[PDB]
Structure 1
Amino acid sequence: AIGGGAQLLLVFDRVLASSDAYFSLPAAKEGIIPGAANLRLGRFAGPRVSRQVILEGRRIWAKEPEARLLVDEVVEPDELDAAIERSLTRLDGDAVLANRRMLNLADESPDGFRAYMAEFALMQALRLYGHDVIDKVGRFG
């Protein structure tokens, strides 16, 4: 899960990963802001790990200790499909719905989000036309 894909994980109620997978926000030196990751990663890994991942492109492997800051279950490719089906049945009731609503309200307030997206709107625009990014993007083949 890289970039936009890795950003997506900071939003899920449950996250499974294959033992050989990794997660990263790679463009530490000449990329655009990694979506809402800058607003959410801290909540998941703390200030230090957030800056290692986003400021210095640190890549995190599924099987290392800190992967549990982002992934709930790391399973062998052979037993992966079964684990997914199993996790899908544990989130059915109304308790889950009520609780995740209260949890999300606490983790990310309406103001926290609106405020962030506001600045992001202009910051991400300027980066979208940054010579360094335009430059880096042209070399991808």
Structure 2
Amino acid sequence: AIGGGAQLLLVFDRVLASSDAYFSLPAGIIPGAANLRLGRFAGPRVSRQVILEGRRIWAKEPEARLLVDEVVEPDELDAAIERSLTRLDGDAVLANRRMLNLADESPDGFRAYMAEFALMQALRLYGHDTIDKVGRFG
């Protein structure tokens, strides 16, 4: 899961990953709302390692546990995915995830971030730094 794909993992209730997967946020522009959310998953050191210095995290290393709930061999993954889908049905699950998200990330928190994000990201989109690098892909 790279870039915007990795960003999505910061918002789910359960994350599973195959033993041979990796996660990265590789530069140029801002990685969506990862700057808002990664710190709460991984702390201030690791999130700068991932975002500012492009550190890559492998599913099987200990700190992958900061982003991923289960790491499973490819053969054993499909069945484990099914088992995880049975464990979240309650109305209690809805009430508890509603309170969890509320505490993790407040309306003000998200709004304040996205406000600055709208301009900061727009500027990054037209910086000489990004335009050249992305134009060397391949």
Task: Give the TM-score band, short-chain normalised.
Answer: over 0.9
Question: 2: distance between equivalents of 1:137 and 1:98?
Answer: 43
Displacement after TM superposition at 1:105 (Å): 0.2
Instruction: Give, in whole Å, the separation in 2 of the partners of 1:101 and 1:18.
Output: 28
- Separation in 1, partners of 2:99, 2:135: 44
State the alpha-carbon separation in 1 of the partners of residues 86 and 10 from structure 2. Answer: 21
The DSSP-based 3-state class of the residue aligned with 2:52 is helix
Partners of 2:34 and 2:99 lie apart in 1 by 21
CA distance in 2, matches of 1:75, 1:15: 11
Distance 1:137 1:131 in 2: 11
- Give deviations 1:20-46, integer Å, cap 9, x for gaps: 0000001xxxx2100000000000000
Which whole-Å CA distance do the structure 1 matches of 2:104 and 2:70 have between them? 21
**How many residues end up aligned between the 2 structures?**
137
Query: Per-residue displacement from partner, 1:49-108 (whole Å, max 9, x unpaired)?
Result: 000000100000000000000000000000000000000000001110000000000000
Superposition TM-score, scaled by structure 1 size: 0.97
Tell me how far apart the structure 1 counterparts of residues 57 and 135 of structure 2 sit (CA, whole Å).
26
> Could you tell me how far apart the structure 2 residues matched to 1:3 and 1:120 are?
16
Q: Which runs of 5+ in 1 are unaligned?
A: none
**The residue matched to 1:51 in structure 2 has which SS?**
helix
Shift of 1:121: 0.3
Q: Percent identity?
A: 99
Alpha-carbon distance, 1:10 to partner = 0.2
Q: What residue is the counterpart of 1:97 in the other structure?
A: 94
The answer for unaligned runs of 5 or more in structure 2 is none
Runs of 4 or more above 4 Å deviation: none
- Structure-2-length-normalised TM-score: 0.99
